[PDB]
């Protein structure tokens, strides 16, 4: 279970929008900006 | 059947874990 805890930590670190499970939420309530979204979407770097 | 005579269990994704069904 602790291993799965670490797995979920790294999963939320890398991927934000994970299906069927909650995203990593900051202390302010906003989701944690995972590196997957850093290159996808308007806020992503690929669009610019 | 594989190419070994052993039945292949089905892997199901529960949450983030994978469970085998022999």
């Amino acid at each position: 279970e602790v291993e799965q805890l670490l797995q979920f930590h790294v999963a939320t670190y890398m991927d934000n929008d994970i299906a069927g499970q909650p995203q990593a939420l900051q202390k302010s309530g906003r989701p944690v900006k995972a590196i997957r979204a850093r290159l996808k979407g308007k806020e992503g770097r690929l669009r610019g | 059947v594989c190419e070994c005579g052993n039945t292949q269990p089905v892997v199901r994704k529960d949450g983030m874990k994978l469970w085998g069904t022999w």
């Binding site: 279970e1 805890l5 979920f8 069927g20 499970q21 909650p22 995203q23 939420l25 309530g29 | 529960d14 949450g15 983030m16």
Partner: protein
């Protein structure tokens, strides 16, 4: 000194992942509140599209509606009977921690966003397992408030139950007769007889054994995955304005939570007007509802925070708090006050007479001697 615990309402579980629930037992409560491990009271869904066109009124027979005792239906007798049966069959103590009903856990899940009702619950710790149910004096006070309800509310409740009667069958469709189908209009409606499923589910490291009242099944009973064919029914006022969508999605959140608890994959609504006339029948998927509400075209961005995932996190946090706080052989009370809507208060019970009465309401004597002889064997 009495010990009191306060849990902030903003508590959210980080890792409230759901293990797929499996039906480990089933029961059918009879008219005399006796539980038998059979599927006699299980219903089978059937409602053709063309039946809506008949403009069937949902108030035929409201004058002879039947209501069961709230205290009798709130007892955990069926779950304890199923637990004794599975313990005798296995011969080893189960690892389950939380014992509850579907409605209690739906109230605990929908509490932040459905804050128009008040409730008090009693928790009893026995053999390392927690059994939670309603509070008898508060339930009596609720009945006292209830007889002051107008006949319009009684007609609405009877309309919901009559819709459930009309949309179900007591047998599988091939095994039903015509008389059992067309006589549902004159069928007496009662809250006593019901079917339930005893299902093991998993939240984080906690195994919860839930007793969920199943309205009916899709077309048959699956002995491998019983949860996949289950279906329930609901009634809601029709929609004609923006406040109508708002109220309908508030009700949809509650019903989706109820279906998600017991793993019901599909949801069905019947729409009624101000005259209690069935207007439309709609069907939805449990896993599609969170996406359906967010992707509506009328209000694309009502809120930047998804309410459903927050609800699931609050449910997981409540489950974890209940498991961690309650110790062995302790009787506690969890009362939610809608006047505050700020935090959840957990209290201890010190009155020996009231504690014993609560235990007897939750744990019957015969189950006590059954667990006693199980302990002696252990």
């Amino acid at each position: 000194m009495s010990k009191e615990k306060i849990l902030p309402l903003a508590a959210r579980s980080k890792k409230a992942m759901l293990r797929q629930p499996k039906q480990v037992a089933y029961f059918s409560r009879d008219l005399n509140y006796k539980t038998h491990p059979d599927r006699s009271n299980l219903s089978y869904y059937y409602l053709p599209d063309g039946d809506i066109d008949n403009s069937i009124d949902l108030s035929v027979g409201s004058k002879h509606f039947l209501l069961g005792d709230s205290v009798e239906l709130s007892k955990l007798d069926p779950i304890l009977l199923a637990l004794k049966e599975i313990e005798k069959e296995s011969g080893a103590k189960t690892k389950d921690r939380i014992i509850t009903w579907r409605g209690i856990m739906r109230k605990l899940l929908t509490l932040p966003y459905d804050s128009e009702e008040d409730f008090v619950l009693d928790v009893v710790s026995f053999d390392g397992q927690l059994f939670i149910q309603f509070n008898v004096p508060y339930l009596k006070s609720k009945d006292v408030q209830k007889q002051g309800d107008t006949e319009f509310h009684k007609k609405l409740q009877f309309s919901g139950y009559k819709f459930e009667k009309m949309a179900t069958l007591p047998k599988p469709w091939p095994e039903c007769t015509r008389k059992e189908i067309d006589s549902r209009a004159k069928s007496k409606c009662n809250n006593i007889e019901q079917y339930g499923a005893i299902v093991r589910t998993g939240i984080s490291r906690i195994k919860i054994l839930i007793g969920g009242a199943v309205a009916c099944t899709a077309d048959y009973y699956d002995e491998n995955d019983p949860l996949s064919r289950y279906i329930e029914l609901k009634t809601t006022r029709t929609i004609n304005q923006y406040k109508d969508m708002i109220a309908f999605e508030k009700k949809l959140f509650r019903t989706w939570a109820q279906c998600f608890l017991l793993g019901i994959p599909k949801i069905i609504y019947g729409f009624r007007d101000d005259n209690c006339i069935l207007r439309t029948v709609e069907e939805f998927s449990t896993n599609d509802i969170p996406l359906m509400v967010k992707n509506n075209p009328l209000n694309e961005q009502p809120k930047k925070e998804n309410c459903y995932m927050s609800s699931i996190n609050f449910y997981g946090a409540v489950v974890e708090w209940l498991n961690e706080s309650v110790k062995d052989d302790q009787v506690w009370k969890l009362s939610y006050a809608k006047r505050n809507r700020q935090y959840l208060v957990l209290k201890e019970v010190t009155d020996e007479n009231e504690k014993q009465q609560i235990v007897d309401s939750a744990i019957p004597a015969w189950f006590k001697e059954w667990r006693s002889e199980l302990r002696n064997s252990e």
